[PDB]
């Protein structure tokens, strides 16, 4: 038979890859970092509280100027906040109220959203009239849209529940590239700082690294036991972190091609909803189902602090580009800005 | 008192936005939201047509006796249900459609599991969900006329080995309804409203209206502490 031959060849290739990875694992990161001082105890306080949403908040995203942000709720509203003064700049009503993601253009001129309607809608913020209007509606996915990120004013990459990712052209509305290879729903994606590669995580408990220009998969990372809900990229672009339903976070290195550290505790038995890094990459922030956020020493895998103050799930969090504040959204319909105290 | 003129103008704009948001929320809070479910083809489109008279999620709006309904149909979502069912946590009620003529048909996948036993599994999964612990279910049992004819040709013992055996519509309908209503475990905080669907298009919206009115009244009594 030929099916058995191909299955055996695939198994042999998997064994060869496992042996090649095991060859280069000489010492663990804990042993290497057992000679650096602990970060200490991290304490943060709530500076602002943004109210005005009437239902669960599902996503948020910072602007590149570290002052404006956009948030999406299932009451059918996108809201743009000025965080310094708490003022609302724009409120945008959506045609479909089942939104699950939102994005902010790095130029500051456009916003994007999508959800259970399988469509990514683009909104223009700078018009001769005083209103915000829809610019384009990208359609072509056969499952719910779970994430979207801008590359420039004319390019955007999305992940769908039909086990696929896509790179679009906003001016024409056509899919420029398609990324297939996952066997489960793709739940998140993250762009590298140079925007030449991106990493995705799916419900088959695996993550993948994709080349944007050539449109193929270079590397596949496994090790989790359940679905991966969140993914983030290390500041220097050579590592990334994943959060999953098995109540652990994990760190992967691109050049070593394997997992470096696991962040878990015996008192945590809930899934991770969101994950992010600090400006230097020393701290890792993760949001959980048990209503609070945990701060981890990335290099030593120790707990360092807790952000508490929400009455329901922490569904989204983000860190500014200058690293001055954190933002957390929640199912209790509030957003909070957090800062450290000298 | 330390705000420049443009700062005050921006604050005024923000206040106007707040007012509009509050008005929109007040308008939207006075509507009934229903989630429509069923296993495969079970007359669900027929029910949609009865109440009324690719895109992911389908919404139908209608009015009956000065009350506004919003019915959500999610049959086009072929992805994992576990990842988006919690979006419907706060609906008023779930309308579950079941075809009575499927008691002897077999799904053409394994040729071993008949369609009715798949509908029972779906109903068990939805009724005992953790997101729907206090949500009422309106159960529609469709195709009674076809069931009446099919009773004679095929006995109900094909689907239920433990049936006592009457081989009549009156007893078979009661047996099937009892089998479906027996799957509700926490039968103290949840109710089931059962209806045998008729051809006429006016006796179904009335039943939905009555059930929704009962649900709203009980919610208000529970809120006031009287229930």
């Amino acid at each position, epitope marked *: 038979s030929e099916l058995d031959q191909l299955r055996q060849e695939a198994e042999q290739l998997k064994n060869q890859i496992r042996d090649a990875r095991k060859a280069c694992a000489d010492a663990t990161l804990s042993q290497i970092t057992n000679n650096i001082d602990p970060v200490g105890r991290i304490q943060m306080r709530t500076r602002r509280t943004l109210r005005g949403h009437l239902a669960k908040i599902y996503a948020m995203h910072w602007g590149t100027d570290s002052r404006l942000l956009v948030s999406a709720s299932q009451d059918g509203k996108l809201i743009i906040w000025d965080s310094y*003064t708490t003022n609302k700049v724009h409120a945008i009503p959506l045609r479909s109220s089942w939104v699950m993601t939102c994005a902010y253009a790095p130029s500051g001129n456009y916003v994007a959203c999508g959800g259970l309607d399988n469509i990514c809608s683009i909104y223009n913020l700078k018009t*001769r*009239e*005083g209103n915000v209007r829809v610019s384009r509606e990208l359609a072509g996915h056969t499952g719910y849209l779970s994430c979207c990120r801008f590359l420039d004013d004319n390019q955007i990459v999305t992940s769908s529940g039909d086990t696929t990712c896509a790179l679009w052209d906003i001016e024409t509305g056509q899919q420029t590239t398609t990324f297939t290879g996952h066997t489960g729903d793709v739940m998140s994606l993250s762009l590298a700082p140079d925007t030449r590669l991106f990493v995705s995580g799916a419900c088959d408990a695996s993550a993948k690294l994709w080349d944007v220009r050539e449109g193929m998969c270079r590397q596949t990372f496994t090790g989790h036991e359940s679905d991966i809900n969140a993914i983030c990229f290390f500041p220097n672009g050579n590592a990334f972190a994943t959060g999953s339903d098995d109540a652990t976070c994990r760190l992967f290195d691109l050049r070593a091609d394997q997992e470096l550290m696991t962040y878990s505790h015996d008192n945590i038995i809930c899934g991770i909803t969101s994950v992010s890094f600090s400006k230097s990459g020393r701290l890792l922030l993760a949001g959980y189902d048990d209503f609070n956020c945990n701060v981890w020493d990335a290099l030593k895998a120790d707990r360092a602090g807790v952000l508490a103050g929400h009455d329901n799930r922490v569904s989204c969090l983000g860190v500014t580009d200058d690293g001055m504040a954190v933002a957390t959204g929640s199912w209790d319909s509030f957003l909070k800005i957090w800062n450290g105290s000298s | 008192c*330390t705000l420049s*003129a443009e700062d005050k103008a921006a604050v005024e704009r923000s206040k*106007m936005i707040d007012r509009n948001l509050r008005e929109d929320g007040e308008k939207a809070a006075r509507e009934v939201k229903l989630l429509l479910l069923g296993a495969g083809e079970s007359g669900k489109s027929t029910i949609v047509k009865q109440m009324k008279i690719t895109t992911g999620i389908v919404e139908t709006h209608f009015t009956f006796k000065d009350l506004h309904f919003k019915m959500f149909d999610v049959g086009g979502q072929r992805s994992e249900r576990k990842k988006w069912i919690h979006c419907f946590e706060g609906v008023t009620a779930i309308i579950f459609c079941v075809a009575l003529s499927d008691y002897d048909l077999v799904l053409a996948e394994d040729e071993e599991m008949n369609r009715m036993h798949e509908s029972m599994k779906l109903f068990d999964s939805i009724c005992n969900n953790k997101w729907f612990t206090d949500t009422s279910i309106i159960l529609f049992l469709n195709k009674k006329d076809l069931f009446e004819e099919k009773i004679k040709k095929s006995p109900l013992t094909i689907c239920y080995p433990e049936y006592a055996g009457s081989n009549t519509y009156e007893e078979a309908a009661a047996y099937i309804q009892c089998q479906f209503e027996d799957l509700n475990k926490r039968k103290d905080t949840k109710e089931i409203y059962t209806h045998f669907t008729c051809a006429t298009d006016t006796k179904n919206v009335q039943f939905v209206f009555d059930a929704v009115t009962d649900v709203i009244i009980k919610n208000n009594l529970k809120d006031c502490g009287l229930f």
Partner: single-chain antibody
Amino acid sequence: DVQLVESGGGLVQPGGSRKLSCSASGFAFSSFGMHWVRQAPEKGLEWVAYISSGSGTIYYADTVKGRFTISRDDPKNTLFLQMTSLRSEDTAMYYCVRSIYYYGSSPFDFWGQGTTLTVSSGSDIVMTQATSSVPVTPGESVSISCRSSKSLLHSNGNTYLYWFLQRPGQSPQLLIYRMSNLASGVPDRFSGSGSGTAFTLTISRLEAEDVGVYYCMQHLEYPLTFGAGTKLEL
């Protein structure tokens, strides 16, 4: 396109009354605050009145308080100025101006065409433009200076100075808002800088359409004073 059209001018005997109308088209009228500004014959600009978005705030100049009333009608997209007991110093051309206020916006960015009105026979910030006329030739570079009596720099990083240019036989046009930013549709040759009280506007090159009068305005506090502009000659 954005349009503001004015009506209601003409000849009026002293002590009479008149109503001026301003009809808007092509933009979301209800979300903009609106201003009435006027220009006396062979003189400079002078702010008159302001009505906010939603008509929750109203401001008048001290020289017209008690005789002028500003109002808006949003369903029909109209702005009205009703004026009574008209003295001989009210003969002028009137302009309808739109402005919107949020973080990052550009107020005063569109002006109407104006209508003419002929009448028969205290702690305000002073804005000073020393030079009143300049001859110049194409291809060169020009600097225009403006000075203030108060520091326009607020304690939030913003300096509230605006630049306008009026070509002969035309309405004024915005060039620079908040002392550094460039308006939409304006060439990149123009630039602005300053400090506290002294401000400058520089034209890196020069063309044949830059002739006209240049005005500096302050928006730190009402009554929103102007300064007598500088005329550029060929």
